[PDB]
Amino acid sequence: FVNQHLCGSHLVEALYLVCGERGFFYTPK
C-alpha cells in the first residue's frame, strides 16, 4: 500500500513532465 503511494507520487510528476501543455487526468482506481 505505502509502496504504491510513493510510486504514485513519482508517477504524477512524470505525467506532468511528458504531458506538458495538454494536461492529464490521474485516476488510481
To another protein, the closest distance from the beta carbon of 12 in angstroms equals: 10
Phi, psi (deg, nearest 5) at residue 4: -75, -35
To a second copy, the closest distance from the beta carbon of 17 in angstroms equals: 6
Q: With binding defined as CB under 6 A, does residue 23 bind ligand Oc1cccc(O)c1?
A: no
To Cl ion, the closest distance from the beta carbon of 22 in angstroms equals: 21
Quote the CA–CA distance of 14 and 12 in Å, as a whole number.
5
Q: How far apart are the first and last CA of the chain?
A: 13
Enumerate binding residues for a second copy (CB under 8 A). 1-3, 5-10, 12-29
